[PDB]
Protein backbone atom coordinates (compact mmCIF):
# COMPACT_ATOMS: atom_id res chain seq x y z
CA UNK A 1 0.00 0.00 0.00
CA UNK A 2 1.06 3.61 -0.55
CA UNK A 3 4.48 3.37 1.01
CA UNK A 4 5.32 6.93 2.10
CA UNK A 5 2.69 6.88 4.88
CA UNK A 6 3.39 10.37 6.25
CA UNK A 7 4.67 11.45 9.67
CA UNK A 8 2.55 11.52 12.82
CA UNK A 9 3.03 13.20 16.20
CA UNK A 10 3.77 11.35 19.44
CA UNK A 11 1.94 13.58 21.87
CA UNK A 12 3.44 16.42 23.87
CA UNK A 13 5.53 16.06 27.02
CA UNK A 14 6.98 18.22 29.79
CA UNK A 15 10.41 18.14 31.41
CA UNK A 16 10.11 17.43 35.13
CA UNK A 17 9.95 14.68 37.75
CA UNK A 18 8.03 13.57 40.84
CA UNK A 19 10.42 12.29 43.51
CA UNK A 20 13.16 14.92 43.17
CA UNK A 21 10.41 17.54 42.97
CA UNK A 22 9.09 16.30 46.32
CA UNK A 23 12.56 16.53 47.85
CA UNK A 24 12.60 20.08 46.47
CA UNK A 25 9.32 20.76 48.26
CA UNK A 26 10.66 19.56 51.59
CA UNK A 27 13.77 21.70 51.27
CA UNK A 28 11.70 24.79 50.49
CA UNK A 29 9.48 24.11 53.51
CA UNK A 30 12.38 23.99 55.94
CA UNK A 31 13.85 27.14 54.43
CA UNK A 32 10.51 28.91 54.86
CA UNK A 33 10.59 28.09 58.55
CA UNK A 34 14.08 29.50 58.94
CA UNK A 35 13.09 32.64 57.03
CA UNK A 36 10.07 33.24 59.27
CA UNK A 37 12.16 32.93 62.40
CA UNK A 38 14.94 35.15 61.06
CA UNK A 39 12.61 38.02 60.18
CA UNK A 40 10.70 37.81 63.45
CA UNK A 41 14.05 37.86 65.26
CA UNK A 42 15.33 40.77 63.20
CA UNK A 43 12.39 42.79 64.47
CA UNK A 44 13.52 42.52 68.10
CA UNK A 45 17.09 43.09 66.98
CA UNK A 46 16.32 46.35 65.18
CA UNK A 47 14.96 47.86 68.39
CA UNK A 48 17.74 46.37 70.51
CA UNK A 49 20.27 47.50 67.91
CA UNK A 50 19.41 50.99 69.11
CA UNK B 1 21.26 20.27 6.17
CA UNK B 2 20.26 21.75 9.54
CA UNK B 3 23.77 20.83 10.73
CA UNK B 4 24.73 24.46 10.20
CA UNK B 5 22.07 25.96 12.46
CA UNK B 6 22.99 23.20 14.91
CA UNK B 7 26.60 24.38 14.79
CA UNK B 8 25.46 27.91 15.45
CA UNK B 9 23.28 26.74 18.31
CA UNK B 10 26.10 24.86 19.94
CA UNK B 11 28.38 27.89 19.75
CA UNK B 12 25.67 30.26 20.94
CA UNK B 13 24.70 28.27 24.01
CA UNK B 14 28.30 27.43 24.90
CA UNK B 15 29.28 31.09 24.87
CA UNK B 16 26.08 31.87 26.75
CA UNK B 17 26.88 29.42 29.54
CA UNK B 18 30.48 30.58 29.84
CA UNK B 19 29.32 34.20 29.93
CA UNK B 20 26.87 33.42 32.73
CA UNK B 21 29.67 31.69 34.62
CA UNK B 22 32.02 34.65 34.29
CA UNK B 23 29.26 37.04 35.32
CA UNK B 24 28.62 35.01 38.46
CA UNK B 25 32.33 34.90 39.24
CA UNK B 26 32.97 38.59 38.60
CA UNK B 27 30.09 39.69 40.82
CA UNK B 28 31.05 37.13 43.49
CA UNK B 29 34.69 38.26 43.46
CA UNK B 30 34.68 39.32 47.12
CA UNK B 31 32.44 36.82 48.90
CA UNK B 32 33.90 35.44 52.12
CA UNK B 33 35.58 32.56 50.29
CA UNK B 34 34.58 31.55 46.79
CA UNK B 35 37.57 30.61 44.66
CA UNK B 36 37.18 31.45 40.97
CA UNK B 37 34.99 29.25 38.79
CA UNK B 38 36.30 28.39 35.32
CA UNK B 39 34.34 26.96 32.39
CA UNK B 40 35.49 24.03 30.26
CA UNK B 41 34.38 23.08 26.76
CA UNK B 42 35.52 20.64 24.10
CA UNK B 43 34.78 19.43 20.58
CA UNK B 44 31.58 17.52 19.96
CA UNK B 45 34.04 14.59 19.78
CA UNK B 46 31.42 12.76 17.72
CA UNK B 47 28.41 13.63 15.58
CA UNK B 48 30.03 13.08 12.16
CA UNK B 49 29.40 10.89 9.13
CA UNK B 50 30.31 10.47 5.44
CA UNK B 51 34.05 10.99 5.02
CA UNK C 1 7.29 -1.79 -26.14
CA UNK C 2 8.58 1.73 -26.59
CA UNK C 3 5.33 2.79 -24.99
CA UNK C 4 5.81 0.27 -22.22
CA UNK C 5 9.38 1.42 -21.78
CA UNK C 6 8.03 4.88 -21.08
CA UNK C 7 5.08 3.76 -19.02
CA UNK C 8 7.22 1.56 -16.85
CA UNK C 9 9.66 4.38 -16.41
CA UNK C 10 6.93 6.85 -15.58
CA UNK C 11 5.52 4.46 -13.04
CA UNK C 12 8.92 3.88 -11.50
CA UNK C 13 9.47 7.62 -11.36
CA UNK C 14 6.23 7.91 -9.40
CA UNK C 15 7.66 5.46 -6.87
CA UNK C 16 10.87 7.50 -6.70
CA UNK C 17 8.87 10.64 -6.06
CA UNK C 18 6.95 8.87 -3.28
CA UNK C 19 10.15 7.84 -1.51
CA UNK C 20 11.55 11.36 -1.90
CA UNK C 21 8.42 12.86 -0.38
CA UNK C 22 8.74 10.48 2.54
CA UNK C 23 12.38 11.55 2.90
CA UNK C 24 11.25 15.14 3.35
CA UNK C 25 8.45 14.11 5.70
CA UNK C 26 11.04 12.40 7.92
CA UNK C 27 13.52 15.27 7.61
CA UNK C 28 13.48 15.77 11.39
CA UNK C 29 12.35 12.39 12.73
CA UNK C 30 14.86 11.61 15.46
CA UNK C 31 17.47 9.01 14.55
CA UNK C 32 15.93 8.57 11.11
CA UNK C 33 17.93 7.39 8.11
CA UNK C 34 17.22 8.44 4.53
CA UNK C 35 15.85 6.21 1.77
CA UNK C 36 15.81 5.70 -2.00
CA UNK C 37 14.66 3.02 -4.46
CA UNK C 38 16.50 0.99 -7.12
CA UNK C 39 15.51 0.40 -10.75
CA UNK C 40 16.14 -2.37 -13.26
CA UNK C 41 15.70 -2.79 -17.02
CA UNK C 42 12.87 -5.08 -18.10
CA UNK C 43 14.75 -6.58 -21.01
CA UNK C 44 13.21 -9.93 -21.94
CA UNK C 45 12.97 -12.03 -25.08
CA UNK C 46 15.18 -9.64 -27.05
CA UNK C 47 15.76 -5.96 -27.86
CA UNK C 48 14.42 -4.08 -24.81
CA UNK C 49 11.67 -6.36 -23.53
CA UNK C 50 9.10 -4.01 -22.01
CA UNK C 51 10.87 -1.21 -20.09
CA UNK D 1 29.28 1.93 19.14
CA UNK D 2 30.03 4.13 22.11
CA UNK D 3 27.18 5.54 24.17
CA UNK D 4 26.37 9.23 24.41
CA UNK D 5 23.94 10.44 27.06
CA UNK D 6 22.07 13.70 27.28
CA UNK D 7 22.12 13.69 23.48
CA UNK D 8 20.19 12.21 20.58
CA UNK D 9 20.85 11.21 16.98
CA UNK D 10 19.59 13.55 14.26
CA UNK D 11 18.14 12.65 10.90
CA UNK D 12 20.83 11.84 8.35
CA UNK D 13 18.46 13.26 5.71
CA UNK D 14 20.04 16.16 3.83
CA UNK D 15 17.33 18.56 2.66
CA UNK D 16 19.46 20.02 -0.14
CA UNK D 17 20.24 16.69 -1.80
CA UNK D 18 16.57 15.81 -1.52
CA UNK D 19 15.51 19.10 -3.13
CA UNK D 20 17.78 18.54 -6.12
CA UNK D 21 16.66 14.90 -6.31
CA UNK D 22 13.07 16.16 -6.22
CA UNK D 23 13.61 18.39 -9.24
CA UNK D 24 15.54 15.70 -11.11
CA UNK D 25 12.63 13.35 -10.43
CA UNK D 26 10.38 16.02 -11.92
CA UNK D 27 12.54 15.83 -15.04
CA UNK D 28 12.46 12.02 -15.11
CA UNK D 29 8.68 11.88 -14.74
CA UNK D 30 8.29 14.62 -17.34
CA UNK D 31 10.47 12.73 -19.80
CA UNK D 32 8.44 9.56 -19.29
CA UNK D 33 5.11 11.36 -19.48
CA UNK D 34 6.01 13.34 -22.60
CA UNK D 35 7.39 10.31 -24.40
CA UNK D 36 4.09 8.66 -23.52
CA UNK D 37 2.23 11.69 -24.86
CA UNK D 38 4.08 11.99 -28.16
CA UNK D 39 3.83 8.27 -28.83
CA UNK D 40 0.15 8.18 -27.83
CA UNK D 41 -0.97 11.18 -29.88
CA UNK D 42 0.94 10.08 -32.98
CA UNK D 43 -0.27 6.49 -32.49
CA UNK D 44 -3.89 7.62 -32.18
CA UNK D 45 -3.11 9.48 -35.38
CA UNK D 46 -2.15 6.14 -36.90
CA UNK D 47 -4.96 4.19 -35.25
CA UNK D 48 -7.31 6.79 -36.74
CA UNK D 49 -5.41 6.94 -40.02
CA UNK D 50 -6.71 3.64 -41.43
CA UNK E 1 18.23 28.29 45.13
CA UNK E 2 20.64 25.60 43.96
CA UNK E 3 17.81 23.09 43.80
CA UNK E 4 15.83 25.79 41.99
CA UNK E 5 18.61 25.73 39.40
CA UNK E 6 18.24 21.95 39.31
CA UNK E 7 14.54 22.21 38.50
CA UNK E 8 15.01 25.03 35.99
CA UNK E 9 17.67 23.11 34.08
CA UNK E 10 15.28 20.22 33.41
CA UNK E 11 12.06 22.21 33.13
CA UNK E 12 12.95 25.72 31.97
CA UNK E 13 13.00 27.32 28.54
CA UNK E 14 15.14 30.16 27.18
CA UNK E 15 14.96 32.43 24.18
CA UNK E 16 17.94 31.37 22.06
CA UNK E 17 16.94 27.71 21.93
CA UNK E 18 13.46 28.69 20.72
CA UNK E 19 15.01 31.09 18.22
CA UNK E 20 16.95 28.21 16.72
CA UNK E 21 13.96 25.89 16.82
CA UNK E 22 11.82 28.55 15.15
CA UNK E 23 14.35 28.86 12.33
CA UNK E 24 14.58 25.08 11.95
CA UNK E 25 10.81 24.72 11.72
CA UNK E 26 10.77 27.55 9.21
CA UNK E 27 13.17 25.37 7.26
CA UNK E 28 11.05 22.22 7.52
CA UNK E 29 7.81 24.00 6.62
CA UNK E 30 9.31 25.64 3.55
CA UNK E 31 10.82 22.32 2.48
CA UNK E 32 7.38 20.73 2.71
CA UNK E 33 5.98 23.66 0.74
CA UNK E 34 8.56 23.01 -1.98
CA UNK E 35 7.77 19.30 -2.16
CA UNK E 36 4.04 20.02 -2.35
CA UNK E 37 4.72 22.52 -5.13
CA UNK E 38 6.69 19.92 -7.06
CA UNK E 39 3.90 17.39 -6.55
CA UNK E 40 1.38 19.91 -7.86
CA UNK E 41 3.52 20.72 -10.89
CA UNK E 42 4.03 16.98 -11.45
CA UNK E 43 0.35 16.10 -11.50
CA UNK E 44 -0.58 19.24 -13.44
CA UNK E 45 2.07 18.25 -15.99
CA UNK E 46 0.34 14.89 -16.19
CA UNK E 47 -2.96 16.69 -16.74
CA UNK E 48 -1.33 18.65 -19.56
CA UNK E 49 0.06 15.43 -21.04
CA UNK E 50 -3.50 14.09 -21.07
CA UNK F 1 -17.34 21.19 31.48
CA UNK F 2 -16.95 24.64 33.01
CA UNK F 3 -17.87 28.16 31.90
CA UNK F 4 -15.62 31.09 31.01
CA UNK F 5 -16.53 34.77 31.22
CA UNK F 6 -15.24 37.48 28.93
CA UNK F 7 -13.84 34.98 26.44
CA UNK F 8 -14.83 33.43 23.13
CA UNK F 9 -13.99 30.28 21.20
CA UNK F 10 -13.38 30.06 17.45
CA UNK F 11 -13.84 27.41 14.79
CA UNK F 12 -11.75 24.47 13.56
CA UNK F 13 -11.31 25.81 10.02
CA UNK F 14 -7.56 25.62 9.44
CA UNK F 15 -6.52 26.90 6.03
CA UNK F 16 -3.80 24.25 5.74
CA UNK F 17 -6.33 21.40 5.75
CA UNK F 18 -9.02 23.09 3.71
CA UNK F 19 -6.90 24.53 0.91
CA UNK F 20 -5.09 21.22 0.37
CA UNK F 21 -8.46 19.48 0.37
CA UNK F 22 -9.55 21.99 -2.26
CA UNK F 23 -6.43 21.16 -4.30
CA UNK F 24 -6.94 17.40 -4.21
CA UNK F 25 -10.69 17.62 -4.82
CA UNK F 26 -10.10 19.98 -7.75
CA UNK F 27 -7.72 17.34 -9.08
CA UNK F 28 -10.69 14.98 -8.83
CA UNK F 29 -12.91 17.57 -10.55
CA UNK F 30 -10.56 17.64 -13.54
CA UNK F 31 -10.24 13.85 -13.37
CA UNK F 32 -13.97 13.37 -13.83
CA UNK F 33 -13.91 16.10 -16.48
CA UNK F 34 -11.27 14.14 -18.40
CA UNK F 35 -13.40 11.01 -18.07
CA UNK F 36 -16.41 12.94 -19.34
CA UNK F 37 -14.49 14.26 -22.30
CA UNK F 38 -13.24 10.85 -23.29
CA UNK F 39 -16.76 9.41 -23.05
CA UNK F 40 -17.85 12.23 -25.35
CA UNK F 41 -14.97 11.24 -27.64
CA UNK F 42 -16.22 7.64 -27.56
CA UNK F 43 -19.73 8.61 -28.62
CA UNK F 44 -18.48 11.10 -31.21
CA UNK F 45 -16.32 8.35 -32.69
CA UNK F 46 -19.29 5.98 -32.78
CA UNK F 47 -21.53 8.74 -34.11
CA UNK F 48 -19.21 9.82 -36.92
CA UNK F 49 -18.31 6.27 -37.97
CA UNK F 50 -21.89 5.84 -39.23
UniProtKB/Swiss-Prot annotation, chain B:
It comes from Salmonella typhi. It comes from the Bacteria. The chain holds residues 1 to 51 of 553 of the full protein. Belongs to the flagella basal body rod proteins family. This is Flagellar hook-associated protein 1. It is found in: Secreted; Bacterial flagellum.
Curated annotation (Swiss-Prot), chain E:
It is found in: Secreted; Bacterial flagellum. Disulfide bonds: none annotated. It comes from the Bacteria. Belongs to the flagella basal body rod proteins family. This is Flagellar hook-associated protein 1. The chain holds residues 504 to 553 of 553 of the full protein.
Amino acid sequence: GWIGNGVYVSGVQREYDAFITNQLRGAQNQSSGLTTRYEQMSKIDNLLAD
Amino acid sequence: MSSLINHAMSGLNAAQAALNTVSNNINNYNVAGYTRQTTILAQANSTLGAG
Amino acid sequence: MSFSQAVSGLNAAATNLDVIGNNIANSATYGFKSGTASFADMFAGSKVGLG
Amino acid sequence: GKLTNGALEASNVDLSKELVNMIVAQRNYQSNAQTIKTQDQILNTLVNLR
Amino acid sequence: KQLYKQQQSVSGVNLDEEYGNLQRYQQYYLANAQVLQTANALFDALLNIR
